[PDB]
Each structure stands twice: as structure tokens, then as C-alpha cells.
Write a protein that binds this ligand. Structure first.
Ligand code: XYL
Ligand code: XYL
Ligand code: XYL
Ligand code: XYL
Ligand code: MG
Ligand code: MG
Ligand code: MG
Ligand code: MG
Lengths: 384, 384, 384, 384
């Protein structure tokens, strides 16, 4: 289960670079130079890294300091063969964003958030990124009078439409991936789930330019089924990026390494990504726990990839097993994939087997055999 | 706070008619004749009632028994002046539906669910309903191999498309309202939130025919903000029906009377429905607790309406208060409603006040005054 | 991973006998004769069965029908070699219990609940049970005025004290195991967690007679860590029974088979039970999903035991692995087991290494190596 | 609803002094001098303030800086008439505590945490505090191998026993109040609920010296009923302190002002504290949202007290209302307060009205009238 860059594993600079500050805690690790992180991730078999503007260039930097920081980063990329597939903007840390970026009640702040985004789109493109994530972590509220949501959604649409006009004006090849989260750091965050973000995108001026960036722990921290939401994103053709991590339950977002958390959901996730032939990088958005020193940071990163690769093997073995394939037919997964009424409405209406002569008791008595199926799944996950 | 039928309060027959069976409990009340429920609801000042097929006509009824049951119901409607604005199908109680109706793995079941729905659409239309709710309570899974979600969403789209073809073929004026729920009675339910259901509708053949039917406790049992999700539904033009009740938290769906549960969310809900001029009936989908006898059933129904009307008064007083209006300006709710960049992209790009000369520290230092605002809201809710 | 009766796996009659009624659903299976269940469980390698009064004898039975039902059950026990280690009372299904058994507001109901319990204690003893579970599923409330909790706890203490006086008066060898649950079927249930139930027992007249009966999904449906709560029960010497099942999250209690649900917690549970040498039976309190027919019921039962045995092997391999033992020392698990100050208070006060000369920065810089440890755990669970 | 110091409202220095750092955010307010906070809280009608060691004296301070900081603080107390009823230790912020204070795996850290605590107990006593809170926010784990909970509970008992020996050795009048929390900042925290903390205290060497310090949002962030847990604490005689705030749901701990959050639970809380004659200060442990400037900080503080006083009036009006008192009798709250069997075991056993001649159907048919009761409660909370 050793990763190679051909597995397309990517990491944010802010993942392994998290210094361990929390609501109740000072930093437990020193800051990492981005160059060190590129080198150490490449040694572990990562394929690339991703960044926020403020991860690569200290906020408030001069043009000369900006150029220097980018030059050193590109040298480390060249040195390692690491790629930069995705970038994003920090619209959450600085206090100016305390009520939002694109949906801040102050109009001046909204306009600033857009200028800051567009500066970093240009930089993303220069570095070869083809995906641009937007996580509106400060869009939302703690109280009901503070944010008129219809107005905030108008603002949010305006901002994304302006970004789409910008990329089109420049001829850039980049696409946007909007990241839902239900809460934290706002009491409630706008576009709280994959569904709300899919729904919002089809109201944009140029929907083809936008998809979702679901994160495992985000859907889980609302108690939702992450493989289900990924399936709906896939069904819609809108899975433009994914953030992989672990979460134990409905609570604060833990950002555990991938595989930790809800292991059975991680299994079903990998089975789905691999069966659908998802083509995007396997991006980890996780935090090594603040208990760890730097050796533990790199071990937690390595574990992300290891767990992905173990689950990929077990899911493939599950699908290839002739006993599983029989069990899937026993449970009528084949029938689920057949159209209900390719014969058409009128044919259905006139079909006595669908109503007047349907034996409901005989159909109700047929068991679904889902427990045999799932125990096969469990035995394959465990290697039993 | 006495309701009149002019307030457009409606109730499902299955609300006040719930006999009190639960996962661990036998019935605590006898079954109600629909005629009695129409009479008692009309006496309390309700405007109308809604039904599942199986609430009005016992499952398996002959044509003669069906006609009789409908005749007696219509006599009670005529007697009271009650309306029937909405109907729905029971695709969840009978064991035939144990893996779904429209997304059951068995194709024969899928076809049956459609025939059963279409029979009741015809009846809804005969009774004057203009809205048809669909709650796929059995669409989903307890285990990951049992349901391939992409295939189930194809099936689900097929079913809704066939229903749209049917209503169009008949020239009926009725619209569909799809009801999300995150879980219960399946481990995870397909279309678990308002967002997922909005997203799904824009993939249907005739989207204009479908909207959502959000229920207070449904969004709450995923920890989501119900007024926020209603605002997104309103923003999209898709709020076709609403189900009102109370819920205390992320747990099993309690179906408490409206006002019980999260009272501050109930306030913000009513403020939003009334400020947006929502035109649909105020429908209660609730269960009087099984502790209650029939006097308590009617008191719980009455309390639904009373609480709505108290919250309507307090929200109106909040919005009309000149101190509140000042506080809203102090918190820049007016600025939230202004376009970010009506001057256009290029104008924003060339505006030095949005970047090169934006004083981020001065903007960050400006407090939002949300606590003063919310304490005004609290004082108005409490009548203080 | 084939169970034998020497593994001490037990099942409630109401587990495999669940007919599949839910909040929204009629039964999907016919009722099982207890005799059939004993025979089928014994064939799968179970060691024993448990019962509620009402599972073995239909509520309202004559003395002659009671004797007959018990005779047939004992013949099946004799036929198979199955044991009956535990019994309990149904104080939740009949509508008389709608506000409680031992804490019902009606005094007459309280007294009835006690008489019903004591009748079944006598029967439990006759069948050889040494443990008597009490699950006050109806003790609690949906609204705040309905139940004065201090008064209800007085009632609850009175009832348990009377039961202790009864068992002592008769010379019986039986002990009580109080089962917490946070909610469902009441809005909130009294003694909602292992901690609340441990706390309550030390106020009883004869605490030695009572312990807890924690259930996996019960603690999980409050988002709590089930292995942690079992550890506190063990620490206190109060783990008198355990109920094993699976749960996916904070939601309605799903009663999935053991291993399903939170698989990593199931691992850590088995590691703890086995490392502590827990001596009680491994009792499954689960429901085969209503999707299943009878073949699926027995497969779900078998899967309970299989998963226990797989996790037992993997946890034992984890603890025996010399690399794990090194990792545990690296993470100072050995130091956690050493007394903080066996030198005593004054010695600590006078120890400059504990304050005036403690290098806090050097201690803070030492990483905990928990990620290496946990990835070893993950590799052992997966057999990697 | 204007507070006076006679209402015994208290605030932590770290409440109004929170600078607004969060998992994703830099500070939005400058640090407050403790002297300013005492002055501003006294102007709002607070009675006193509470502190962590590190709130009053910067970590690492010389003896001379420690004396200065305490002198200025005492001058502000003298200037205002504010009291210091409670103190606590910071065993969570510094990185040395990243795996715990009293249950850190490193023994040296455990010993340090005890020395740091005892230094601040001496200071608390000097300032007149009679209560000492302990919140083991770092006691717990993110992964299952990292913390053997039985060993950690032994350590935790040792630490509390040593603190009890210390206070007894010095002749101090101070009592300890242990603060449960379920999670955040550890994945799971030891003593996660009021129940677990009550249970733990009765294993200490000198239980009379320890009680609980429940916090509203802590119990709520596990989905538990805070008034219920306070009632059990009261029933046990162990409510030594309370932390008042608001929380919207099972999610990260929001620390909203008191009244915000679950308003109906806040009502029932105040009704219980006032009906039981709780004698301790009404302490607010809350964070003014980081959206706010300093004017908003003081308004959020004021709102804590205002909401308490409004709820106190409404709860008193509820209990005094003759219609409510009738409704309570209708719902048999009077019968709940009567002993079940003061006639004794044998008398119950021989009472045919409790079994052989108990009419279960007639008792089951009696409704509980809880909905009428609760709607009275709702009308009183709303002033309707
Ligand atoms: O919850 C934090 C979010 O996961 C971010 O890390 C975004 O992915 C990128 O800003
Ligand atoms: O959770 C149950 C749902 O609320 C139903 O009552 C639908 O609204 C109608 O079938
Ligand atoms: O939640 C249901 C409880 O688990 C019961 O099955 C008790 O264990 C026994 O009555
Ligand atoms: O969750 C944070 C806790 O509420 C603390 O503020 C303690 O009360 C005191 O350290
Ligand atoms: Mg992310
Ligand atoms: Mg509904
Ligand atoms: Mg149980
Ligand atoms: Mg606190």
C-alpha cells in the first residue's frame, strides 16, 4: 500500500502546516515553510499540493516579497515534480471577514473579497491549477436578524457570476468548486450541504463553470451520508473536487486523517469513487492532531494515503467476488438499474400487472437479502 | 389569537388521527373517522384538511367502499366549508414498500407505486387539491451495498417525469411538492434536505411542475437552520408547500405541535413567511403526543394555530419598531440588499477603493451590532 | 470465526423476533414462536436467550396459558442446552405505561409496574437467570411541566429500593442492571447515559445489588464514546450486563447488528472487554432490518457473533504485536498507569521538578506519537 | 428587568474578555484589562467576577508582576464592591497540556498541573472565593489507543484526592465544582456529562468537598436536557456551581449569551433554579460573538442578565397562576410527588388493587393533559 505520484494524492499546505491552534489552545508546532512541506510530501509519494493565497504569501506582502515567496515555491515544485492542481482564497481568517467575504453585510468588504479572489485566480493559473475552490466559511450567522438569506444569496450569486465573467474574459481554463459546510465558524453557514450548493449552482449565469467540493467531515458533521451526497454530485455531473478526511460524529469538525472517523463510510466512498472512475485528485483536507510533533505530522499524512489504498483494494475485491455479484442479484441491484417504464406512460397505465393484478403480498414477502450482502461487505473490508 | 378560516390553517388527517403507535408502544387512542376530524378541526378555526390515499380509503377497498368513504368525506367538507388543498400517497406503511416506492430495487414495486400515486392524483383533483406532496420516506438504505444511489436517482427522476407527463396529459392544474427528510424510517433517506430536493428538481423534464415541501422538524433533525432553508427555497421560487411542527434537537422526529421545539426558530420562520408574503396554506404535520386523550388532541391542534398567530404578531411588531429599523441599519442589513458591483466587473477591477486603497483595519474594527439587534428580537418575542 | 456456546453469546427473544413495525410501517415478518427462536439460535452457536415477561407469555394470559407457555420454552431450552442468563419486564408497550412505569405520574400505575416486575423476577429465578435488566424507556417527558424530575427520581429510587428489599426477602441471587437511553420513545428519558445511571445507583439503599446495562447504540445516539463509558462502568465495578448492537450516528436508535455502525468503536469496545476480562455474556440487543425475511434474520444474528469474533482476533493481535507495545511506550501509556504522586502531597509540594524547575517548553515539545499508534491499530483492524 | 448586585450575577473575566480567536479566525478585539472589565460589569449591575489563574496573571510572570497584577485587580474590586466567588485553573491553553493536565500521559505534566492548581487555590482563597471550578478540557482523546480510560480515571481520582487533602491541610473553606463537557477541544472528553461527573465524585476520598459545575451548552452539545441534568444534580445535593449560556444544537460549543439558544430550555432552567431556591451565583460563561465591537460585548453581557430576569418573572407567573395549578393537578404532578408504597413491600404485595384487580384499560384511557399544561407554559413564557 505504498503510494506513488501516479495515484494523484494531493494535500493542502494548511494541512500538514497546521500549527495546532484551537478554540482553547495555543500552537503546538512551529510554522512550516511551504518548501519543506513540498519536499516532505513528495518524499511520502504525494503528487501535488494546494494552497490558499495567504498560505503561500503572507497577508500584506509587498510585490517583491510576493515574487520571492512564489519563486521559492516554484523551485520546490520543480525540484520534486509536484503539481499544484487547485488553489483557493482565504476569506475567513482576517477580522475584516468576520461577517463574510462575498456575503458580508458591508458592501466594501464584498468588493474587497472579490478583488482578493481575482488576484489569486491569476496566480493559480500561473502555477497550473485547473480548479479553484471557494469555501465561504464566514457566510452565515449566529442570530436570525443579522442576515437576510435571500439577500445574501443574491450577493453570493453576484460574486460567483462576476468570477465567471472574469475567467471567461481572460480565457482561462479553470473551473470553480464550491465547498459546503453546515456550521463552524458561523452558527449556520450558507450552502450548508452538497445539496444546497448543487441547487445554488444551477441559478448561476454560467453553471458549467461551477461544481461542488464536498468534504467528508462536512456532510458528516450534519449527520448526512457522505457517499450518498457524492453519488448525487456524480449523478448531476458536478463533482469538481473532493476533500478527504475523517470525522467522528455530529460535533465540531475534527479534520482527522482519512480512514479515521467513520471507517465503513470511508469504504463505501472509495468503492464509489473507483467504480465511477472519478478522475480528479484524491485531496486530503485534514489536520494532524495538535498532540503530534513533526514526525507525527508526516505519519498522519502517510496514513491518509495508506488508508485510501487499503480501502481501494478491499472495495475492488468486494466488487470482483463472484459471491458478492450473486448477492447483488439476489438483492435486485440489477433491477434497480433497469428503467421502471421504458414502455411509457400509457403502457404502464394499461398494464394490469402493475395494479389490478399485482400481488402485493407476494412482493412484500420477498426479502431483500441486504444483511447477507452487507456481511460480505464487512468480511471484505476486514480481510476475513 | 383566535384563528379564523381566513388564516389558511390546514391539518393532515393523519395528524390529529394518529393513534399513538411508536417503536416501543401500542396505540393509545382509537382511530378517528375522517368526518369527525373535519368537524372538530373546522370548530377550532381550521380552513382545510389534507390526506394520504390510505387515510381516506382503507387499503384494499372495493370500488363501492371507496365511493362511500369519499361521499361521507365530501359531505363533511360541504357541511363545514373546509377545503382540501393538498393530497399525497402512502408509499411507506405497507410492507410491499419496505425498500421504497419509486426507488424500490424491485421493478414491479416501482410500477405499482406509480399506479397507486396516479389513482390518488385523480382523486385529489376531484376534491379540489392544487398541490400534491410526495414524501419518499422509504427511499434509501441502512447499508451501503443495498442501494446504488445514482441508479436510484435515475429511477426517482423517471417516476417524477412520468407523473408530470400524466398531469400534463390530463390538463390538470396541480403541482408537486417533494418532501425531504434525512432519516427515519430508513437509515438514510434519499433527498435528505431542502437543498438536495431543490437540486434534484432542476434535473426533471418539466421543472416548473415541482417544488419542495420542507418540514420544520426534518431540517432540524439534521441540525440545519429551517428558516435558512426556507429562504433558499423562496429565493429559488420553489416553496410549493410547507409542513409546520416542532422538534427538540437532532434525534428521532418528534412531530411536536408548532411553537414547541425550537421556539426562536419558529419566530424567525414566521417572520420570514410573513415578510415574503408566502401565499400557501399554513399546514401542520404534527402528532399529538400519545400521552394525550382526545381532548388533548384538539388542544394540541388549537395550540399549533395559537402559536403561529402569537409569533406573527411579535414578528410584525419587531419589524415595525423604529428602534429595530434603526438597529437593522446599524448592522448594515440595508447594505446587504444592495448589489455588490452594479458598476460591473471592469469598474470593480479598476476601483482602487476595493483593493489598493481599502483600509482593511478600519473595516475590521467596525462592529456589526448584531447582539443589540438580537436582543431587540428577543424582547419582541417575549413581549418585554 | 465460528461461534460455539463457550463464547457466551446471548440474544433477546425480541431481537430476532422483531416483526418490523416502525413509526411509519406495518410488520414485515410474522411473529416467531420462542421455541423456534431457541432452536435456530442454538443452531447458530448461541449460548442463551433472554426475555421480557411479555415476550414469553402473552399479556393478560391465564395461569394455565402462562404455565403452558413456560413449559414449552423450558422444553426447547432442555432440547438445545441453551441458558437464560437474564430477564426483564416490559414496562413500555402497553398504553397504561404511556407516562412511565416506576415514574408514571399516576401512583396506581407505579404500583402496578412494581407488581408486574416482581412477578417476572420470580419467573426469571425459576429459569436460572442471575441478572435482571430494567430499561425505563417510558420514564421521562416531551415537555417541561409534565415531569418534575426530582420527584421522579424519588419515585425511581423507591421502586428500585423495593425491588432490592424483595430479592433480599426471598434470598435470591439475582442482581439488577439499569439500562440508560437518552431519548426514544420519550422526548428525553430519565437516566439518559451510563454516567447518570451510575450516579443514581449510589443513592440506592443497597447499591451492591445494582449495576448498569449499557447499550452501544444508546450512548452513541447522544454522540458519546461507548468504549469510554464502558471503561467508567468497569472502573466503578458496575458493569453487570451489556447490550451489543450498531448505530450510525446521532439519530433514532437503529439497533443494527453488532459490527455495523461505528466499526472502529466496535473494535475498541471488544479490545476493552477482552483486556478487562469481562465475565458476563456477550448479549445482542439488535433488530434485523425489516427489509429482511427469515433467512436474513438468522444471517443478521450470525453476523453479530462473527463480527465480535473477528474484532476479538484483531484486537488480540494488536495488543500482542511487539511494534504496538513499543508504540504504547512511545506514547507513554505506561506512564499513564503509574501513580502521579505516590510520594504524597508534601513531597509533591516540595518537589522543585514539578514547578519551579519544570521545563514546560521541553515537555510541550515532546510529541505524543498517537498517530503512529492509531495507524498500527487501523492496520491491525484491517488485517493489513 | 434591571439587574442589581442583589441578583448575584457573575461573569468570568474570559467571557467579556474573549478576543474572538476561533478555529478559522484571528482576534477581532483587543485584550481587555481585568480592571476595565470589573468596572464595566459593575456598571451593568453584575455582582462579581471569576477568573482563571492565567486571566489575572500572565503565564510566566515574576513574583513582582504577579503581585502588581493582583493589587490592581483588588483595587478595582474595592472600587466597585464586586466580589470574586469562584476561581479556576487554566489547564488547557499552553501546549504542555496538549494531552491533559491531571490525566496527561506524561507523569511530569500531571504533577505540574497539580502544582499550578494549588498555587491558584491559595490565591482564590486570598480573594475570597468559596468555590473552585475544575474543567478538564484536555482530558480525553482523539483515538482509542491513546488513553486507557480506567488508568486515566485512577489519575483523575488521585489528583482530586490530593487537592482535597491540600484544602483540608490548610483549613480552607472552599469546595470544588467539576465541569463536564462531552467534546471540544478533545475528540471525547473524560466526564462528558453531569451524570459521569456525579458518578466520579462519589468515588473520591472526601466526596463532600466536590460537586458539579454544569454548563448549559455542554449538556446541549450532547443533545441532553439541561434542566433534567440540573434536577439530578439538585436531587443528589451536588449543584455547587452553574455556568449559564446558550447553544443551538448538537454542534461545536457556541457560548452564546444566556436566553439565546434554546429559549424554552432556558425557561425551564430558571423555573427549576428558582423553585429549588438555588443559592449559588448566576454565573455566565459565554462569549460575545466575534462580529461585535466593545459596545456589543457589554450589550451581550447585559442581555445575559436581562434574559434571566425576564424568564424569572414569566416562570413565577406560571407557577402562581391558579389555572396552571389546576392543570398540574389534572396532569397528576401532585401524585408524582407522593410515595409509591409508604405502606411498604408486603402491603404492596398483598394489595389486589395493584395487580389482580387493577383495571389497566381504565388507567390507560386517562389522558395526561400535558398539552394543555404546556400551552399554558408557552402562553406564560410569551406573555400571551
Ligand atoms: O472547514 C475548512 C474547509 O475545509 C477549508 O479547509 C477549505 O477546504 C479551503 O479553505
Ligand atoms: O415524516 C413523515 C412526513 O412528514 C409525512 O407526514 C409526509 O409529510 C406526508 O406523507
Ligand atoms: O431501546 C430498547 C432497549 O434496548 C430494550 O430492548 C431493553 O434492553 C430491554 O427492554
Ligand atoms: O468550555 C469551556 C469551559 O466552559 C470553561 O470556560 C470552564 O468553565 C472554565 O475553564
Ligand atoms: Mg475543505
Ligand atoms: Mg410532512
Ligand atoms: Mg437494550
Ligand atoms: Mg464553563
Amino acid at each position: 500500500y505504498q503510494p506513488t505520484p501516479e495515484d494523484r494524492f494531493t494535500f493542502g499546505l494548511w494541512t500538514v502546516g497546521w500549527e495546532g491552534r484551537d478554540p482553547f489552545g495555543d500552537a503546538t508546532r512551529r510554522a512550516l515553510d511551504p518548501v519543506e512541506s513540498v519536499r516532505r510530501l513528495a518524499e511520502l509519494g504525494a503528487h501535488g499540493v494546494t494552497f490558499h493565497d495567504d498560505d503561500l504569501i503572507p497577508f500584506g506582502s509587498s510585490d517583491s516579497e510576493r515574487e520571492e515567496h512564489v519563486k521559492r515555491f516554484r523551485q520546490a515544485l520543480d525540484d520534486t515534480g509536484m503539481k499544484v492542481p487547485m488553489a483557493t482564497t482565504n476569506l475567513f481568517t482576517h477580522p475584516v471577514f468576520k461577517d463574510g467575504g462575498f456575503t458580508a453585510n458591508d458592501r466594501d468588504v464584498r468588493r474587497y473579497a472579490l478583488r482578493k479572489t481575482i488576484r489569486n485566480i491569476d496566480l493559480a493559473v500561473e502555477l497550473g491549477a485547473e480548479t479553484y475552490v471557494a469555501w465561504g466559511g464566514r457566510e452565515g450567522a449566529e442570530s436570525g436578524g443579522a442576515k437576510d438569506v435571500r439577500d445574501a444569496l443574491d450577493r453570493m450569486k453576484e460574486a460567483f457570476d462576476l468570477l465567471g465573467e472574469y475567467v471567461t474574459s481572460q480565457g482561462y481554463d479553470i473551473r470553480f468548486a464550491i465547498e459546503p459546510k453546515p456550521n463552524e465558524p458561523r452558527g449556520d453557514i450558507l450552502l450548508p450541504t452538497v445539496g444546497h450548493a448543487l441547487a445554488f449552482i444551477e441559478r448561476l449565469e454560467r453553471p458549467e463553470l461551477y461544481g461542488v467540493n464536498p468534504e467528508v467531515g462536512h456532510e458528516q458533521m450534519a449527520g448526512l451520508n457522505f457517499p450518498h451526497g457524492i453519488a448525487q454530485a456524480l449523478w448531476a455531473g458536478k463533482l469538481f473536487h473532493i476533500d478527504l478526511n475523517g470525522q467522528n460524529g455530529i460535533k465540531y469538525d475534527q479534520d482527522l486523517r482519512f480512514g479515521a472517523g467513520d471507517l465503513r463510510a470511508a469504504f463505501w466512498l472509495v468503492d464509489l469513487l473507483e467504480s465511477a472512475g472519478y478522475s480528479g485528485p484524491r485531496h486530503f483536507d485534514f489536520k494532524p492532531p495538535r498532540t503530534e510533533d513533526f514526525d507525527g505530522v508526516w505519519a498522519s499524512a502517510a496514513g491518509c494515503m495508506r488508508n485510501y489504498l487499503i480501502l481501494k483494494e478491499r472495495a475492488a475485491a468486494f466488487r470482483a467476488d463472484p459471491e458478492v455479484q450473486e448477492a447483488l442479484r439476489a438483492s435486485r441491484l440489477d433491477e434497480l438499474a433497469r428503467p421502471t417504464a421504458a414502455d411509457g406512460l400509457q403502457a404502464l397505465l394499461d398494464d394490469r400487472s402493475a395494479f389490478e393484478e399485482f400481488d402485493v403480498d407476494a412482493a412484500a414477502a420477498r426479502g431483500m437479502a441486504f444483511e447477507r450482502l452487507d456481511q460480505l461487505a464487512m468480511d471484505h473490508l476486514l480481510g476475513a
